[PDB]
């Protein structure tokens, strides 16, 4: 898992609720770097809160399950990684449990700035295809991220 | 996947929206058994319907990732495989999107009609603690099925 060991980049992000990674929303979270230690994932990120950019320290703890790791952020988060060009991006989803109700926010981190076309494009349609609208699609590559 | 392609049975039943599982539901499904061809899950169940059990085979797609396949089947589905005793029971987690809502469908699988308290006590616990009620845990080596 030393692979993920790296400075990313968030380049899209998207979720089942629109709220969670629109601004001020506890998910939209611009990812700074990766620390692996046993197994674990230890996210460097900034957020803007209250139009500021404060630091955010998030652990995806390894779970004995593969690919998956554990999150208590705005309540407890399954997550996952795949990608097809570990070398190039990461994909990261979260699978949310708040206030007894259950939400996806997606990940697209990037080993650069900005990803390609056809791995962006995959990224939106995957999340078209399961039933999300445009607007909960966000692609930050282009805003002004902290 | 040489240790799935047995005999299996629906031990208990978990899901974020109850009526997905209750009597009718669309995921109440009593697995009969699972055959594994070129990777894919090949599943044969029986499902009451309209009153009476009637057969139903689903095929869990494998993907690029470990332990994750796909399914169409009331909307698309994300399933993940995991079990720490592989030849005692098995579970599938649904990660379901349907009419833009995102719903979670969990199985527990016995090579037996049921499974030891620890097992199923820790399945429960799991989504007892993301929010789950004990009216969406539903344990079913107990009622009578197909």
New interface residues.
């Given amino acids: 898992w030393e692979q993920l060991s790296r400075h990313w980049h968030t380049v899209v992000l998207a979720s089942?609720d629109r709220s969670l990674i629109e601004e001020e929303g506890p998910f939209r979270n611009f990812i700074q770097n990766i620390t692996v230690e046993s197994g674990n994932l230890n996210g460097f990120f900034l957020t803007r809160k209250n139009g500021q950019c404060i630091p955010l320290y998030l652990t995806a703890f390894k779970t004995?399950?593969?690919?998956?790791f554990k999150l208590n952020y705005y309540?407890?988060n399954?997550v996952?990684y795949?990608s097809?060009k570990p070398n190039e991006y990461a994909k990261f989803i979260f699978?949310n449990?708040?206030?007894?109700?259950?939400?996806?926010v997606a990940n697209l981190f990037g080993r650069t700035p900005n990803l390609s076309n056809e791995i962006k494009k995959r990224f939106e349609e995957d999340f078209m295809?399961?039933?999300?609208?445009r607007e909960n699609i966000l692609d930050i590559s282009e805003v002004d991220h902290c």
Wanted: charged share 35%; net charge negative.
């Fill in positions: 089942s004995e399950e593969a690919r998956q309540g407890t399954d996952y795949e097809s699978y449990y708040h206030d007894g109700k259950v939400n996806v295809n399961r039933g999300f609208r």
